[PDB]
Design a protein around this motif. Structure first.
Motif, PDB file in Angstrom:
ATOM      1  N   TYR A 140      48.519   5.475 -15.581  1.00 22.09           N
ATOM      2  CA  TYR A 140      47.433   4.648 -16.079  1.00 22.09           C
ATOM      3  C   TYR A 140      47.955   3.273 -16.476  1.00 22.09           C
ATOM      4  N   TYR A 141      47.223   2.240 -16.075  1.00 17.99           N
ATOM      5  CA  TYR A 141      47.396   0.882 -16.584  1.00 17.99           C
ATOM      6  C   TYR A 141      46.129   0.582 -17.379  1.00 17.99           C
ATOM      7  N   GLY A 142      46.191   0.780 -18.690  1.00 16.53           N
ATOM      8  CA  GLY A 142      44.972   0.740 -19.476  1.00 16.53           C
ATOM      9  C   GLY A 142      44.105   1.929 -19.115  1.00 16.53           C
ATOM     10  N   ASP A 143      42.844   1.658 -18.779  1.00 17.24           N
ATOM     11  CA  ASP A 143      41.890   2.691 -18.402  1.00 17.24           C
ATOM     12  C   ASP A 143      41.797   2.878 -16.890  1.00 17.24           C
ATOM     13  N   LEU A 144      42.770   2.368 -16.140  1.00 15.19           N
ATOM     14  CA  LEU A 144      42.757   2.414 -14.685  1.00 15.19           C
ATOM     15  C   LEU A 144      43.911   3.271 -14.190  1.00 15.19           C
ATOM     16  N   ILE A 145      43.628   4.157 -13.242  1.00 13.39           N
ATOM     17  CA  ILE A 145      44.639   5.015 -12.639  1.00 13.39           C
ATOM     18  C   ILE A 145      45.120   4.357 -11.354  1.00 13.39           C
ATOM     19  N   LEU A 146      46.434   4.235 -11.207  1.00  7.73           N
ATOM     20  CA  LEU A 146      47.042   3.635 -10.029  1.00  7.73           C
ATOM     21  C   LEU A 146      48.037   4.615  -9.426  1.00  7.73           C
ATOM     22  N   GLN A 147      48.073   4.664  -8.098  1.00  9.99           N
ATOM     23  CA  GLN A 147      48.994   5.529  -7.377  1.00  9.99           C
ATOM     24  C   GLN A 147      49.433   4.829  -6.103  1.00  9.99           C
ATOM     25  N   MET A 148      50.745   4.742  -5.898  1.00  9.17           N
ATOM     26  CA  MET A 148      51.287   4.171  -4.671  1.00  9.17           C
ATOM     27  C   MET A 148      51.251   5.232  -3.577  1.00  9.17           C
ATOM     28  N   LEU A 149      50.547   4.937  -2.487  1.00  5.12           N
ATOM     29  CA  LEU A 149      50.418   5.888  -1.392  1.00  5.12           C
ATOM     30  C   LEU A 149      51.493   5.710  -0.331  1.00  5.12           C
ATOM     31  N   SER A 150      51.960   4.485  -0.109  1.00  2.00           N
ATOM     32  CA  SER A 150      52.963   4.235   0.912  1.00  2.00           C
ATOM     33  C   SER A 150      53.783   3.015   0.523  1.00  2.00           C
ATOM     34  N   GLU A 151      54.967   2.910   1.122  1.00  2.00           N
ATOM     35  CA  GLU A 151      55.851   1.774   0.879  1.00  2.00           C
ATOM     36  C   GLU A 151      56.760   1.628   2.087  1.00  2.00           C
ATOM     37  N   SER A 152      56.659   0.499   2.782  1.00  2.00           N
ATOM     38  CA  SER A 152      57.474   0.218   3.959  1.00  2.00           C
ATOM     39  C   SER A 152      58.308  -1.020   3.664  1.00  2.00           C
ATOM     40  N   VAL A 153      59.621  -0.846   3.568  1.00  2.00           N
ATOM     41  CA  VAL A 153      60.531  -1.917   3.176  1.00  2.00           C
ATOM     42  C   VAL A 153      61.203  -2.456   4.431  1.00  2.00           C
ATOM     43  N   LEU A 154      60.906  -3.706   4.766  1.00  2.00           N
ATOM     44  CA  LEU A 154      61.559  -4.416   5.849  1.00  2.00           C
ATOM     45  C   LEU A 154      62.457  -5.516   5.304  1.00  2.00           C
ATOM     46  N   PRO A 155      63.359  -6.061   6.116  1.00  2.00           N
ATOM     47  CA  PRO A 155      64.275  -7.093   5.608  1.00  2.00           C
ATOM     48  C   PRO A 155      63.574  -8.300   5.004  1.00  2.00           C
ATOM     49  N   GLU A 156      62.426  -8.717   5.542  1.00  2.00           N
ATOM     50  CA  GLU A 156      61.772  -9.941   5.091  1.00  2.00           C
ATOM     51  C   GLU A 156      60.556  -9.705   4.204  1.00  2.00           C
ATOM     52  N   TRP A 157      59.885  -8.561   4.318  1.00  2.00           N
ATOM     53  CA  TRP A 157      58.785  -8.248   3.416  1.00  2.00           C
ATOM     54  C   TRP A 157      58.628  -6.738   3.290  1.00  2.00           C
ATOM     55  N   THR A 158      57.821  -6.337   2.306  1.00  2.00           N
ATOM     56  CA  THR A 158      57.503  -4.942   2.030  1.00  2.00           C
ATOM     57  C   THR A 158      55.996  -4.821   1.864  1.00  2.00           C
ATOM     58  N   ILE A 159      55.398  -3.829   2.519  1.00  5.56           N
ATOM     59  CA  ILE A 159      53.962  -3.583   2.439  1.00  5.56           C
ATOM     60  C   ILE A 159      53.743  -2.242   1.755  1.00  5.56           C
ATOM     61  N   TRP A 184      61.821 -15.622  -0.039  1.00  3.63           N
ATOM     62  CA  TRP A 184      61.341 -16.984  -0.284  1.00  3.63           C
ATOM     63  C   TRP A 184      61.916 -17.496  -1.593  1.00  3.63           C
ATOM     64  N   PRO A 185      62.923 -18.368  -1.559  1.00  2.00           N
ATOM     65  CA  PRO A 185      63.539 -18.819  -2.814  1.00  2.00           C
ATOM     66  C   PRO A 185      62.583 -19.656  -3.650  1.00  2.00           C
ATOM     67  N   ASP A 186      62.635 -19.438  -4.963  1.00  3.01           N
ATOM     68  CA  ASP A 186      61.838 -20.222  -5.897  1.00  3.01           C
ATOM     69  C   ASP A 186      62.149 -21.706  -5.740  1.00  3.01           C
ATOM     70  N   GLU A 191      63.777 -19.655   5.397  1.00  3.33           N
ATOM     71  CA  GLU A 191      64.760 -20.226   6.313  1.00  3.33           C
ATOM     72  C   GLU A 191      64.161 -20.613   7.660  1.00  3.33           C
ATOM     73  N   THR A 192      63.054 -19.996   8.065  1.00  2.95           N
ATOM     74  CA  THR A 192      62.397 -20.333   9.316  1.00  2.95           C
ATOM     75  C   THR A 192      60.897 -20.446   9.088  1.00  2.95           C
ATOM     76  N   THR A 193      60.232 -21.188   9.974  1.00  3.75           N
ATOM     77  CA  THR A 193      58.774 -21.182   9.976  1.00  3.75           C
ATOM     78  C   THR A 193      58.241 -19.865  10.524  1.00  3.75           C
ATOM     79  N   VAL A 270      56.484 -30.603   3.446  1.00  6.01           N
ATOM     80  CA  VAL A 270      57.045 -30.816   4.778  1.00  6.01           C
ATOM     81  C   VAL A 270      56.999 -29.524   5.582  1.00  6.01           C
ATOM     82  N   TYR A 271      57.370 -28.411   4.948  1.00  2.90           N
ATOM     83  CA  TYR A 271      57.401 -27.125   5.637  1.00  2.90           C
ATOM     84  C   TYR A 271      56.039 -26.776   6.218  1.00  2.90           C
ATOM     85  N   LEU A 272      54.962 -27.077   5.485  1.00  8.30           N
ATOM     86  CA  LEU A 272      53.621 -26.817   6.000  1.00  8.30           C
ATOM     87  C   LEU A 272      53.370 -27.561   7.305  1.00  8.30           C
TER      88      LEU A 272
END
Ligand SMILES: Cn1cc(-c2onc(C(=O)O)c2CO)c2ccccc21
Length: 287
Positions: A140-159, A184-186, A191-193, A270-272
């Motif tokens: 529970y986060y307060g009055d809300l129930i949360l549950q992680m159903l899946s997690e896919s960890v890749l080198p550049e992002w995680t879904i 993505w550094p603060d 490093e690439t577009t 510039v990156y944009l």
């Protein structure tokens, strides 16, 4: 498109002279708006950074809790997009003392997609609290129930995919997708577009499958630099695909009207432009 190439080359001429001038022309935009609510003493512990506060005119409000007049506050702001006045909610990386508020906002604003473009710790500095479950066990986060159903960890992002619901109506559960860009550094850029373009397209394709959903949440540590660049890129890639004219200046201008410092550095600006140029060149290659 074909015009943007010449426009970008014009901006890059003379060591980015006109690009810098253009970016500097945005520095004051939206900054005469008040942040009085965020400056209330009882909200002081709810802001990660003293200098990054939401404007009264655009802040996201939580439902009021009795016996607490400041129970409506969260450091978060509504942001227009290409198709909705409230297409995005931008917020800070939650603190331990605000992560219940973060999930309350997710629930109340009918959020189905969350984008995170900061790591929790970077170069030894805490940037964001690990505000989601660490395993498949619900909590529970307060009055809300949360549950992680899946997690896919890749080198550049995680879904990740979460299940959220209120304790009173368990049958009224909602699926939330979490897109965590981890390279993505603060205050900097990837490093690439190609990397962030692929990430943005991955997210947008998921957003478009939730037409009845509330705003898309986007956050970094402050909810400003990396968050602003993600939203700007999302907006302009849509404009380009819809054959419309890319308007990077206008996107960042509109962002600044709704939250301070969005797109924090000139290098992010510039990156944009580089992202758009790279897309066009990959497409012009076929022609
Ligand atoms: C203290 N502070 C922190 C930021 C800031 O902006 N974007 C980010 C991000 O997380 O990408 C951060 C986090 O460092 C910032 C911007 C302008 C003025 C002061 C500031």
């Amino acid at each position: 498109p074909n015009q943007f190439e010449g426009h970008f080359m014009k901006l890059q001429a003379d060591s980015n002279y006109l690009l810098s001038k253009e970016y500097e022309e945005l520095k004051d935009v939206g900054r005469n708006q008040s942040c009085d609510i965020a400056l209330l003493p009882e909200n002081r512990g709810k802001n990660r950074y003293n200098n990054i506060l939401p404007y009264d005119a655009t802040r996201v409000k939580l439902s009021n809790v009795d016996d607490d007049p400041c129970s409506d506050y969260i450091n978060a702001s509504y942001i227009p997009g290409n198709n909705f006045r409230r297409e995005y909610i931008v917020t800070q990386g939650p603190l331990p003392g605000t992560k219940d508020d973060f999930w309350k906002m997710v629930w109340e604003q009918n959020v189905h997609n969350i984008v995170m473009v900061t790591q929790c710790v970077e170069k030894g500095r805490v940037k964001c609290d690990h505000y989601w479950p660490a395993d498949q066990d619900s909590l529970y986060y307060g009055d809300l129930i949360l549950q992680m159903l899946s997690e896919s960890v890749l080198p550049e992002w995680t879904i990740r995919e979460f299940k959220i619901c209120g304790e009173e109506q368990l049958d009224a559960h909602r699926l939330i997708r979490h897109f965590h860009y981890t390279v993505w550094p603060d205050h900097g850029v990837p490093e690439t577009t190609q990397s962030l373009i692929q990430f943005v397209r991955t997210v947008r394709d998921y957003i478009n499958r939730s037409p009845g959903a509330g705003p898309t949440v986007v956050h970094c540590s402050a909810g400003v630099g990396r968050t602003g660049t993600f939203i700007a890129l999302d907006r302009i890639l849509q404009q380009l695909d819809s054959k419309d004219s890319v308007d990077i200046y206008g996107a960042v201008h509109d962002l600044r009207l709704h939250r301070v410092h969005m797109v924090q550095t000139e290098c992010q600006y510039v990156y944009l432009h580089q992202c758009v140029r790279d897309v066009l060149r990959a497409r012009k290659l076929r022609s």
